[PDB]
Design a protein around this nucleic acid. Structure first.
Length: 188
RNA sequence: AGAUCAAUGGUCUGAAGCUACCAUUUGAGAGAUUAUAACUGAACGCCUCUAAGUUAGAAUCUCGCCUUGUCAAGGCGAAAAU
């Protein structure tokens, strides 16, 4: 069945603006602006009012209708990123070897050393708009920060998957850098 | 003394050329991705690597490097003398 009409709306808080057109959104807030392209989905996105953005699908099938709330969630994450940003805190877990984490290339590359005692150096470049920080207060804590949740979480996952154990069962060789918390920059 | 013949008379050494892992020299890079592990994220107000969208990804695959390139819309240029 093709449902005639199905829509969902996103309401923007104060101090944020969106200016959507042609299925491209340009959210902007205190922490800068995020531009997102949604042209891979054929829905009508419009401004209904002064701070409400409606995403609507005409005659959609189950799979297409599944993407309305996906797009709305993406725009909500855009709002959150431009207001309070995203910060992923990761913890280093090790049995014997301290996992040494440093930043190089103008703080654009994360270098991991001594993971499980290996002499190889693991290098993770950071995407544009994402910064990293080694916590001086809390030991063995890395923090990845930025506006765009996609890129922040992608960098965090790159770091987490970089430290993988090989040829040893992972059920107790649990060393590695694991995302311990997903929170915001500004205390919410 | 010089040489000849014995279908290469025979023995020793034997350059040159040819030749031996029996000597010596040289043999390497990207791209898209598979399985897989993940990100964001609905469907299904929760979850979820998946549905849309995103990451990393290999003796595989394609290309590079390397060999041929008398190629029938007679494959296509530059340039010299005619």
């Amino acid at each position: 069945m093709k449902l005639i009409e199905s829509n969902d709306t996103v309401v923007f808080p104060e101090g944020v603006t969106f200016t959507v057109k042609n299925r491209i959104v340009h959210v902007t807030g205190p922490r800068g602006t995020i531009r997102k392209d949604f042209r891979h989905l054929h829905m009508e996105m419009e401004r209904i009012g002064k701070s409400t953005l409606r995403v609507r699908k005409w005659f959609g099938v189950r799979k297409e209708l599944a993407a309305i709330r996906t797009v709305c969630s993406h725009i909500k994450n855009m709002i959150k990123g431009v207001t309070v940003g995203f910060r992923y805190k990761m913890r280093s877990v090790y049995a014997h070897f301290p996992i040494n984490v440093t930043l190089q290339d103008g703080n654009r590359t994360v270098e991991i050393r001594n993971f499980l005692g290996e002499k190889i150096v693991r290098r993770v470049p950071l995407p544009e708009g994402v910064i990293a920080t080694i916590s001086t207060a809390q030991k063995d804590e890395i923090v990845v920060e930025g506006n765009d949740v996609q890129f922040v979480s992608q960098a965090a996952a790159r770091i987490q998957q970089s430290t993988a154990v090989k040829e040893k069962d992972i059920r107790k060789f649990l060393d590695g850098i694991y995302v311990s918390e997903k929170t915001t920059i500004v205390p919410t």
